[PDB]
C-alpha cells in the first residue's frame, strides 16, 4: 500500500508505524541471514580439500565452525566433515521455518499490532514497553553469550591454538572470572605493543569475559523489564522515535571498526590454522625461516635489539616484533627471542608451520591474483561496511533529530 | 558566579570566531601541532625512517627548501607504538626517531575532528541543518586514512604520509609501486569525483556569473537574476554530493589498500599459441611498478 509519501526509494519507510508488518520484514531478514549462513556453509563444504589448509581455499565460514572445535584435531587436521554438514543444513532448514513467518506476518497477517494487548504491542514513545523489548532481548543476548560458555566448559569445544604441542581442541576446565584481569583489558592503550581488546592471549580470558558478559547482559536485561527510564534521558541524552534504528546504526559501525582490527591482529579467537597468518605473523615467519636456513648452510645478522632492549628480529620486520604466536613461544627466551634456544629447542612442527606461513603472506587483488588471505577479506569488507554504517548513521540520525 | 561568565563567552555566536565546546579541544591541539610543525619544519635533526643508521634529513636548516622539506615519519623500530617524549630516553633520541611526526599527526587528527564538531556546533546554534559537517567528513576521512588507517594496516607509522611537498610525492610513488593504485577502481572514482568537482565548479560558476545582473543588500536581500534559457531544485545537492562521495570512495580505497587488497594486475592477459606472451598496456604499468618497487629495496 503506497498510499502517499516515500517516493519509490523509501518504501521501507512506509512501515515506520505499521507495527505488525514491520515485524514480518524483520523476520524475513533473519531468514535471509540464516539462509546465507547455511548456503555459504554448503558452498564452502562442496569445494573443500581437507588435506589442504582452509586459508588456501578461500573459506570464511568453515573457520568459524572449526574455531569452536567441531570436527578438528591437532594443528587443524580435519577428522569428520559431518559437523560442518549438520551446521550447514540446520541453518538452511531453520531459515525456511523462519522464512515462513516472514511471509505470514508480512503478507497474510495483520497490518498493525496496536489492537492486541500489553505485550506484543509498541509505539515509539510509550517507553515502558520499549525498555521491555530491550531488556527482553538482553536476556537473549546473555543467553547466547552463555551458550559459548557452555560450549567451552561443558560441550568439549573451543579449539585453542595455544595448546602445548601443535594446537588441539581443549576443554576449558576453569575460566578466569577475576575482575582485575578481566576489565583490566578494557583499560589498556589501543596502540602498538598492547592491544585494547584485540590483545587476548589466553582462552581462559575469552571464557571469563563471557562470564562477565552473560552475568551483566541478563542481570541488566531483568533491570530493563522492571524499571522505567530515569531523569538523565531528556536533559543531555535525548529521546526520539525512529532514531533507534540510528542508535543501533552508529554503534554497529564501531563494532565493525573493532572486528576489522580483531581479525587482522588477533591470533587466539581467530587461530592461524584456519584463517591464515596475520600481518605480523607471515613476516615473522619469513624472518625465522631465513635464520634457520642460514644456520645450516653458509647479536648477529638477524637478531637485533628492540627500543626497550629486547632481542628481536632485524631488517624490515622490526615493526612486527610485538607478535606472539604458538610456534614462537617455545623459542622466545628471557629478554626476547634468544639465539641459543634456536639451536637448543627446535621441533619439526615449528619449521613446517613457519615455512607455510612464510609462503602465504597477505597480498592480492580483487580478482584474487597474488592468493588473497581470508583475514584480508574480512578486514576490508567490514571496514567498508563500518564506514558505510557510519555514513548511514549520520543520515538516519540527521533526519530523525529534526522532529 | 565566575563560571557563567565563561559559559557565556564560549557559547556566544556574537564573537569574531566561534569557540564552541568543541573549540575548547580544537584550539590547543591545533596550536600544538602547528607550533611543532613550524619548529620541526625549520629546525629538526635527521630521522631514520628505517632501522639502520642512515637518517633522512627533512628540515629546513639541514639543507632543504620549501619543496623538498618535510617532517619525516617515525622509525621502523617504533612501528605502531605510542611515542611521546617521556617514553624516550633523551630528547635527542626522541628527535632522532621521528617523534615530532607522531605528535603532529595525533594533535592534528584530534583538532580536525573537533573542527568537524565545531562546524556542527555552530550550525545547531545558528538554526541550520547539518550538511556542512557531513561534507567536511570527506577530507577528514581522507586525512584519517592517510595518517592512521594505512599505518595500522601496514603495521608502522613509517608508512604514513610525510608532512612535506616532496614526501607526498614519495608516498604516492611508493604506494603505486606496492599497491598499483591507478588500476584500483575506488581511486578511479576519486579521480572522477575530483575532476567532476572542478568541472561542475567552473561550469556552475560560469553559468551563474553570466546569468546574474544585480544583487543588493539594504545593510531583505534583492537579486535580479537574468532568467530565460534556450531550448526539483537539487543542483547544489548534486554539486556537494558528487565531489564528496568521490573523495569518500578513494579514502576507503586507500583504507582497503591498508590491508593489502590492492588494485588490479592484469598480468599477462593476452597470449599467443606458441607459448608467447603478448604485452598490453597493463604490462607496461606493471613493468614500471617493478621499477619503483625494486628501488624501494
Amino acid at each position: 500500500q503506497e498510499s502517499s509519501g516515500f517516493a519509490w526509494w523509501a518504501g521501507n519507510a512506509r512501515l515506520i508505524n505499521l507495527s505488525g508488518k514491520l515485524l514480518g520484514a524483520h523476520v524475513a531478514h533473519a531468514g535471509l541471514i540464516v539462509f546465507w549462513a547455511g548456503a555459504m556453509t554448503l558452498f564452502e563444504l562442496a569445494h573443500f580439500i581437507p588435506e589442504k589448509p582452509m586459508y588456501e581455499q578461500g573459506l570464511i565460514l568453515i573457520p568459524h565452525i572449526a574455531t569452536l572445535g567441531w570436527g578438528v584435531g591437532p594443528g587443524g587436521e580435519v577428522v569428520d566433515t559431518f559437523p560442518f554438514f549438520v551446521v550447514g543444513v540446520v541453518h538452511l532448514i531453520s531459515s525456511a521455518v523462519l522464512g515462513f513467518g516472514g511471509v505470514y506476518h508480512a503478507i497474510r497477517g495483520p497490518e498493525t499490532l496496536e489492537e492486541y494487548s500489553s505485550f506484543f504491542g509498541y509505539d515509539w514513545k510509550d517507553k515502558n514497553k520499549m525498555t521491555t523489548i530491550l531488556g527482553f532481548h538482553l536476556i537473549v543476548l546473555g543467553i547466547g553469550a552463555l551458550l559459548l560458555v557452555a560450549k567451552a566448559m561443558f560441550f568439549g569445544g573451543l579449539y585453542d591454538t595455544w595448546a602445548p604441542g601443535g594446537g588441539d581442541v581443549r576443554v576449558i576446565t576453569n575460566p578466569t572470572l577475576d575482575p582485575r584481569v578481566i576489565f583490566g583489558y578494557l583499560l589498556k592503550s589501543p596502540f602498538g605493543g598492547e592491544g585494547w581488546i584485540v590483545s587476548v592471549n589466553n582462552l581462559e580470558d575469552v571464557v571469563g569475559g563471557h562470564i562477565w558478559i552473560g552475568l551483566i547482559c541478563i542481570a541488566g536485561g531483568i533491570w530493563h523489564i522492571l524499571t522505567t527510564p530515569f531523569g538523565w534521558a531528556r536533559r543531555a541524552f535525548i529521546w526520539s522515535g525512529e532514531a533507534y534504528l540510528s542508535y543501533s546504526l552508529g554503534a554497529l559501525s564501531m563494532m565493525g571498526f573493532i572486528a576489522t582490527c580483531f581479525v587482522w591482529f588477533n591470533n587466539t579467537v581467530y587461530p592461524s590454522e584456519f584463517y591464515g597468518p596475520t600481518g605480523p605473523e607471515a613476516s615473522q615467519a619469513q624472518a625465522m625461516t631465513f635464520l634457520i636456513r642460514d644456520q645450516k648452510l653458509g647479536l648477529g645478522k638477524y637478531l637485533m635489539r628492540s627500543p626497550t632492549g629486547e632481542i628481536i628480529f632485524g631488517g624490515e620486520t622490526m615493526r612486527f616484533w610485538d607478535f606472539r604466536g604458538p610456534w614462537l613461544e617455545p623459542l622466545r627466551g628471557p629478554n626476547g627471542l634468544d639465539l641459543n634456544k634456536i639451536k637448543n629447542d627446535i621441533q619439526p612442527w615449528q619449521e613446517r608451520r613457519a615455512a607455510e606461513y612464510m609462503t602465504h603472506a597477505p597480498l592480492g587483488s580483487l580478482n584474487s591474483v597474488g592468493f588473497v588471505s581470508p583475514r584480508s577479506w574480512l578486514a576490508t569488507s567490514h571496514f567498508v561496511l563500518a564506514f558505510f554504517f557510519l555514513v548511514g548513521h549520520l543520515w538516519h540520525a540527521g533526519r530523525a533529530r529534526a522532529a | 558566579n565566575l563560571w557563567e561568565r565563561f559559559c557565556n563567552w564560549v557559547t556566544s555566536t556574537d564573537n569574531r570566531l566561534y569557540v564552541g565546546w568543541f573549540g575548547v579541544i580544537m584550539i590547543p591541539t591545533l596550536l600544538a601541532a602547528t607550533i611543532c610543525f613550524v619548529i620541526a619544519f625549520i629546525a629538526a635533526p635527521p630521522v631514520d625512517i628505517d632501522g639502520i643508521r642512515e637518517p633522512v634529513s627533512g628540515s629546513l636548516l639541514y639543507g632543504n627548501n620549501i619543496i623538498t622539506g618535510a617532517v619525516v615519519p617515525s622509525s621502523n623500530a617504533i612501528g605502531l607504538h605510542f611515542y611521546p617524549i617521556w617514553e624516550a630516553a633523551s630528547l635527542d633520541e626522541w628527535l632522532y626517531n621521528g617523534g615530532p611526526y607522531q605528535l603532529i599527526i595525533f594533535h592534528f587528527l584530534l583538532g580536525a575532528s573537533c573542527y568537524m564538531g565545531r562546524q556542527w556546533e555552530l550550525s545547531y546554534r545558528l538554526g541550520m541543518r547539518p550538511w556542512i559537517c557531513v561534507a567536511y567528513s570527506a577530507p577528514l576521512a581522507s586525512a584519517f586514512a592517510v595518517f592512521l588507517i594505512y599505518p595500522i594496516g601496514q603495521g608502522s607509522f613509517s608508512d604514513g604520509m610525510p608532512l612535506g611537498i616532496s614526501g607526498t610525492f614519495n608516498f604516492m610513488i611508493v604506494f603505486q609501486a606496492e599497491h598499483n593504485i591507478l588500476m584500483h577502481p575506488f581511486h578511479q572514482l576519486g579521480v572522477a569525483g575530483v575532476f567532476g568537482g572542478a568541472l561542475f565548479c567552473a561550469m556552475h560558476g560560469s553559468l551563474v556569473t553570466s546569468s546574474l545582473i544585480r544583487e543588493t543588500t539594504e545593510t531583505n536581500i534583492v537579486a535580479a537574476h537574468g532568467y530565460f534559457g534556450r531550448l526539483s531544485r537539487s543542483l547544489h545537492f548534486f554539486l556537494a554530493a558528487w565531489r564528496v562521495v568521490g573523495v569518500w570512495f578513494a579514502a576507503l580505497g586507500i583504507s582497503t589498500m591498508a590491508f593489502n587488497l590492492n588494485g588490479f594486475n592484469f598480468n599477462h592477459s593476452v597470449i599467443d599459441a606458441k607459448g608467447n606472451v603478448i604485452n598490453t598496456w597493463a604490462d607496461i604499468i606493471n613493468r614500471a611498478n617493478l621499477g619503483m618497487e625494486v628501488m624501494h629495496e
Binding site: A236 | C7, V24
Partner: peptide, 29 residues
Amino acid sequence: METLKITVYIVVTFFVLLFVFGFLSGDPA
C-alpha cells in the same frame, strides 16, 4: 621526563573534563 609527563596529563584531563562538563551542565542562561 616525569616533570613533563604529569604536566601533560594534568592539561589533557583539564581539557577533556572541561569539555564534558561544559557540554552537559550549563546549557541554559
